[PDB]
Design a protein around this nucleic acid. Structure first.
Ligand SMILES: [Mg+2]
Ligand SMILES: [Mg+2]
Ligand SMILES: [Mg+2]
Ligand SMILES: [Mg+2]
Ligand SMILES: [Mg+2]
Ligand SMILES: [Mg+2]
Ligand SMILES: [Mg+2]
Ligand SMILES: [Mg+2]
Ligand SMILES: [Mg+2]
Ligand SMILES: [Mg+2]
Ligand SMILES: [Mg+2]
Ligand SMILES: [Mg+2]
Ligand SMILES: [Mg+2]
Ligand SMILES: [Mg+2]
Ligand SMILES: [Mg+2]
Ligand SMILES: [Mg+2]
Ligand SMILES: [Mg+2]
Ligand SMILES: [Mg+2]
Ligand SMILES: [Mg+2]
Ligand SMILES: [Mg+2]
Ligand SMILES: [Mg+2]
Ligand SMILES: [Mg+2]
Ligand SMILES: [Mg+2]
Ligand SMILES: [Mg+2]
Ligand SMILES: [Mg+2]
Ligand SMILES: [Mg+2]
Ligand SMILES: [Mg+2]
Ligand SMILES: [Mg+2]
Ligand SMILES: [Mg+2]
Ligand SMILES: [Mg+2]
Ligand SMILES: [Mg+2]
Ligand SMILES: [Mg+2]
Ligand SMILES: [Mg+2]
Ligand SMILES: [Zn+2]
Lengths: 105, 86, 52, 60, 50, 134, 135, 122
RNA sequence: CGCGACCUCAGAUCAGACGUGGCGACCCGCUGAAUUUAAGCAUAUUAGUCAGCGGAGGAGAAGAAACUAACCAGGAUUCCCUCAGUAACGGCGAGUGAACAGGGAAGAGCCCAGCGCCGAAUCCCCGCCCCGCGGCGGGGCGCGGGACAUGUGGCGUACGG
RNA sequence: CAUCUAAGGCUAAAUACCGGCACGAGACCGAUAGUCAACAAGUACCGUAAGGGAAAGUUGAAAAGAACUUUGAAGAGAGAG
RNA sequence: CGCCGCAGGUGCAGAUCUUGGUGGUAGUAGCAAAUAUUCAAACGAGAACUUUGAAGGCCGAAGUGGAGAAGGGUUCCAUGU
RNA sequence: CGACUCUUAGCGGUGGAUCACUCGGCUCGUGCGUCGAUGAAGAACGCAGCUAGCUGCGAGAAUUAAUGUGAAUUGCAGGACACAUUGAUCAUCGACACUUCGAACGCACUUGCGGCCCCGGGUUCCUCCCGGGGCUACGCCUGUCUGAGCGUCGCU
């Protein structure tokens, strides 16, 4: 029952939520595991860059973020063509390539 | 008389031992175990009785093959080889 | 198991507490009141050479 | 009187007794005891003395 | 009854053979903790499953 | 202190391992110190107790300088019976009193091929330890 | 369609569940045909199937099966995938084309029910309460 | 007095079976002594003779099995008990040859564009 | 009025293989309530949940756009934070309720059919010889069988070839 | 106008894991508690069956577990140790 | 165990509360369906009850008799306590 | 004076609270992540000198071999065991073995009854009896053999 002034609250706890609760006590263990895997991968690709292939410069899509620039999935085929790198050779020297991205400008 | 008098007339067994699962639930007239469902290929098991499931799950018995499997797993299931003779 | 065992403290608060503990570790009355037998210690901010 | 394997029939018991005691037997009667062991009464042929055979076996 | 099957007779034989007291030398073993056979079954008190 | 993450420091686990140890490591658990003369002769300190070696009790009611040969190594009860470590019971018969091997010192070792091999292995490990810590 | 298999049409409950006729099975008849072929030949792997005819009361499909242990399949790459254990009874887990069509999988705004790989996976992710260590 | 497995392996089948028969008649006599009272020595000899029978039979069976293995060595079809028994699933999987063989297109790709070892300056 | 070829079928304790049943915490496909809440109750809620059935693996499923967007555009899947208790749904009542963009963990791409060209170039099995055994492969020979033109293999797949 | 190219197929990683094998730990419980079960516990026992399902830890450092005498038929006592 | 902090499965007379134990009742109700016992002896520490003998009775062949089915499962038979 | 009753205290009973103990749980985390027709899980019956349960094992039955170890096991007994012409015990476990039901597989079971092929015995080769061994389930793929069709054809 409502009691004086308050906020009309709608808790989403009508659906046996106690059977599906995700605790996070394995979060520090997961951080350790991922860190160890990163170290092992960096050791495995011994002189190659640890983070991976070089990603392209990409502008964020919508009107909220288009003033910002981030890393893309891969270099376009037109980019590789006018840079003079074969699309099947780039992935061996560590250039990521996105065959489905076009260049509008 | 539904009570003591009628208890005197029970002398024909409904169930006998079951060749699978060894329980005294093999309905003779239906020719079917009411615990494991023996003539059926698959064991009778229901999730509404976790207690009954854990009474007869794997591990409640002997595990003749599975114990050896668990031991053999630790060495990659090696075969055809023997320790180097002394 | 979901009792909220952990608490998060502001970084500024935690740095504040470190600064307070360090400042209090240089006052002989407070160290003696923690009961640390600093009676023949030549200097309470006791600093030794790097070879240690 | 012998205690025999519960899976052995009268022919097997007769042949086993004949071979491992060098005697000839007339008939074998067989029961299974309330404890589960099979018991065989092996009557010997008229020209064999079960007393002497039991003495050689060592069960007198 | 007098008429019984081989499986029934063998089951009864096993239940007969395990209905006996513990050997007295058992209680002299190191760390025994056993006093008397608690699985004793009398024919008149407790009836068999079959 | 202990840093190995695969060896436990749990009291219950340690006690369970100790009391359910198989006899071939109950042999390790039932080790005794050597006397000072033996510890100087061989470069070893401890030694698993053996059926036919002679010891001195150093703790308890039967302690003293008397040398007594071991007559039994009762590994199930973690005790050893020695020659004169005994008492009269009610009817007048004499029964051995078992004592822990950690409370004796081995004065003479029952020496055979295996004992000599164990002694030299222990001495060699101790010597490599000393030359590592030199 | 799929008549609800209840005795005398009695579906004891609220009126919204009183339906018996005009009910439909979630999977298609082609998927059912593939499942029957696979269940009969559990020693083979259902690859795909196609429509070969229909009647007022029957539909006819032909189901392609592969013997995973034949040497012509084992020794040929690009068909060795079907021999792996993760591919036994695809038609009973809806991994064929006909079976997959009923799961609502796809890309884009029409298929948000199955983000995560399946409807049940999406449901679990959306209905799990993430109770972090620091709240 | 006891028999060992290491000095049984030099002997042939006939004398191994003769040894087995002697041990069996000895065990039967020991059981007779068990039921006719007997003595503690004869009662304790039962286990020794039983283990000796087991030892002789183990040597016989091992010799026969190793002879069968050397006879079926190199043959296309072997009896199931002579085949390895890793795990049912591990017997169902591809062997090494068909596990690692590749298509002509795959190996042509691998030849044309092999993975390169490289480093990137900062 | 028999002998053959093919097609479609059958039998075999034929030669060699394969499936079944269990476990089922996690995963995939179905089926699927009512208690409960709504201060009654029928739509709604519980809940696509419990129970029921089937199928797997060490993970599974998903997955390289018949996508998102509307921007100066992004770019497979999966997971986390956030979007967001929001847009929306709802006896618009009780209640329910995502996605895109953004930041991260990880990051990897590809193969057929078809259209074509290449004397079926292709594959399985059985023999015999050699090298081997450790899961049975390589090489060689066969006027040795079979599969296959009602289409095997090589090139090639929307990024064009 | 933009965007993709359906109705064929494969694919690791990050992700899940109240069953299993083997470990480590705890501001947890301490024998009416904590698992039903610290113990010959899914046992004894109950029900035709589906199924239901306990109670029950502690001599002492060491058995050194009371020899022997005595009353009583013994249980049980008095001395002694 | 005290003090300074921290954290709770933190305080019992009640719940026809849960489990365990124990009272008064109380040496009480009761050990009353189907006619019935008695004498002597033996064994034995001990005899209304066991055994033998003698007597008086009952079941009265649709039996309180002699044998089976089902069910029980060693209860059967000796010896001993 | 006594009995009886009540209160309190000493002692003794009945009872098993309290406290101390803990080879047990519960919770979290990690690494692996492995069953089965070559017969699983499960069940039954057996197996020890004295052994009922628990545990272990399978007619080689509280275990064989092998390797490591290195003098015990133990409640009692017994006998081992030069510890080097090799060894108690334990651990490990890669060799061998692994009864009957059970997906359970010749047919069937609250019982029982077959068929085929070899081997041995009574026979004294011919097929009856006994014993031993190996086969004999369903579905399905590839191939093989034997076939069927007033299916489509060729030749005569
Ligand atoms: Mg990254
Ligand atoms: Mg009634
Ligand atoms: Mg009936
Ligand atoms: Mg008979
Ligand atoms: Mg009764
Ligand atoms: Mg190709
Ligand atoms: Mg065949
Ligand atoms: Mg299955
Ligand atoms: Mg309501
Ligand atoms: Mg209400
Ligand atoms: Mg109502
Ligand atoms: Mg409704
Ligand atoms: Mg369910
Ligand atoms: Mg997959
Ligand atoms: Mg997929
Ligand atoms: Mg594409
Ligand atoms: Mg907000
Ligand atoms: Mg909903
Ligand atoms: Mg082609
Ligand atoms: Mg408890
Ligand atoms: Mg207590
Ligand atoms: Mg008494
Ligand atoms: Mg409380
Ligand atoms: Mg109270
Ligand atoms: Mg109150
Ligand atoms: Mg009265
Ligand atoms: Mg009266
Ligand atoms: Mg009369
Ligand atoms: Mg009568
Ligand atoms: Mg008192
Ligand atoms: Mg050995
Ligand atoms: Mg019949
Ligand atoms: Mg024709
Ligand atoms: Zn059953």
């Amino acid at each position: 029952a409502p009691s004086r002034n308050g906020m009309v609250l709608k808790p989403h706890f009508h659906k046996d939520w106690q059977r599906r609760v995700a605790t996070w006590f394995n979060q520090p263990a997961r951080k350790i595991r991922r860190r160890k895997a990163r170290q092992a991968k960096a050791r495995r690709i011994a002189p190659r860059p640890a983070s991976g292939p070089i990603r392209p410069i990409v502008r964020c899509p919508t009107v909220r973020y288009h003033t910002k620039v981030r890393a893309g999935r891969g270099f376009s085929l037109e980019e590789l063509r006018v840079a003079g790198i074969h699309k099947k050779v780039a992935r061996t020297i560590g250039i990521s390539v996105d065959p489905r991205r076009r260049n509008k400008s | 008389t539904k009570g003591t008098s009628s208890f005197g007339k029970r002398r024909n067994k409904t169930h006998t031992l079951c060749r699978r699962c060894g329980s005294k639930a093999y309905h003779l007239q239906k020719s079917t175990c009411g615990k494991c469902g023996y003539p059926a290929k698959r064991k009778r098991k229901y999730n509404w009785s976790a207690k009954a499931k854990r009474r007869n799950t794997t591990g409640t018995g002997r595990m003749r093959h599975l114990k050896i499997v668990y031991r053999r797993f630790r060495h990659g299931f090696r075969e055809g080889t023997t320790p180097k003779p002394k | 198991t979901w009792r909220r065992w952990h608490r998060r403290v502001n970084t500024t608060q935690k740095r504040y507490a470190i600064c307070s503990a360090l400042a209090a570790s240089a006052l002989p009355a407070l160290v003696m009141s923690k009961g640390h037998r600093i009676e023949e210690v030549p200097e309470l901010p006791l600093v030794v050479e790097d070879k240690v | 009187v012998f205690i025999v394997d519960v899976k052995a029939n009268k022919h097997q018991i007769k042949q086993a007794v004949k071979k491992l005691y060098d005697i000839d037997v007339a008939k074998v009667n067989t029961l299974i005891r309330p404890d589960g062991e099979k018991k065989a009464y092996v009557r010997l042929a008229p020209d064999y003395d079960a007393l002497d055979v039991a003495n050689k076996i060592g069960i007198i | 009854s007098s008429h019984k099957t081989f499986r029934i007779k063998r089951f009864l034989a096993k239940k007969q053979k395990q209905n006996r007291p513990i050997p007295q030398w058992i209680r002299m073993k190191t760390g025994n903790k056993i006093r008397y056979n608690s699985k004793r079954r009398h024919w008149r008190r407790t009836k068999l499953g079959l | 202190m202990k840093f190995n993450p695969f060896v436990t420091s749990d009291r219950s686990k340690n006690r369970k391992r100790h009391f359910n140890a198989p006899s071939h490591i109950r042999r390790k658990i039932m080790s005794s110190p050597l006397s000072k003369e033996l510890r100087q002769k061989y470069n070893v300190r401890s030694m698993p107790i053996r059926k036919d070696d002679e010891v001195q009790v150093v703790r308890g009611h039967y302690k003293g300088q008397q040398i007594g040969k071991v007559v039994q190594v009762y590994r199930k009860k973690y005790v050893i019976y020695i020659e004169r470590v005994q008492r009269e019971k009610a009817n007048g018969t004499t029964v051995h009193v078992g004592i822990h091997p950690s409370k004796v010192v081995i004065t003479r070792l029952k020496l055979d091929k295996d004992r000599k091999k164990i002694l030299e292995r222990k001495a060699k490990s101790r010597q490599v330890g000393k030359e590592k810590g030199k | 369609g799929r008549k609800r298999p209840v005795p005398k049409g009695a579906t004891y409950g609220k009126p919204v569940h009183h339906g018996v006729n005009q009910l439909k099975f979630a999977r298609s008849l082609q998927s059912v045909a593939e499942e029957r072929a696979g269940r009969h030949c559990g020693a083979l792997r259902v690859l795909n199937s196609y429509w070969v005819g229909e009647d007022s009361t029957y539909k006819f499909f032909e189901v392609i099966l592969i013997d995973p242990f034949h040497k012509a399949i084992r020794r040929n790459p690009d068909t060795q995938w079907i021999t792996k254990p993760v591919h036994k009874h695809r038609e009973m887990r809806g991994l064929t084309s006909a079976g997959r069509k009923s799961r609502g999988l796809g890309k884009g705004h029409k298929f948000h029910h199955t983000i995560g790989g399946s409807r049940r996976a999406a449901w679990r992710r959306r209905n799990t309460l993430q109770l972090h260590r620091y709240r | 007095a006891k028999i060992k497995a290491r000095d049984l392996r030099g002997k042939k089948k006939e004398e191994l079976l003769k040894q087995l028969d002697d041990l069996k008649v000895e065990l039967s006599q020991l059981r007779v002594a068990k039921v006719t009272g007997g003595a503690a020595s004869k009662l304790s000899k039962i286990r020794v003779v039983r283990k000796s029978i087991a030892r002789v039979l183990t040597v016989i069976n091992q010799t026969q099995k190793e002879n069968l293995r050397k006879f079926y060595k190199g043959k296309k079809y072997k009896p199931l008990d002579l085949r390895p028994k890793k795990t049912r699933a591990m017997r169902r999987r591809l062997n090494k040859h068909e596990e690692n063989l590749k298509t002509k297109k795959q190996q042509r790709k691998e030849r044309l564009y092999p993975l390169r070892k490289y480093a990137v300056k900062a």
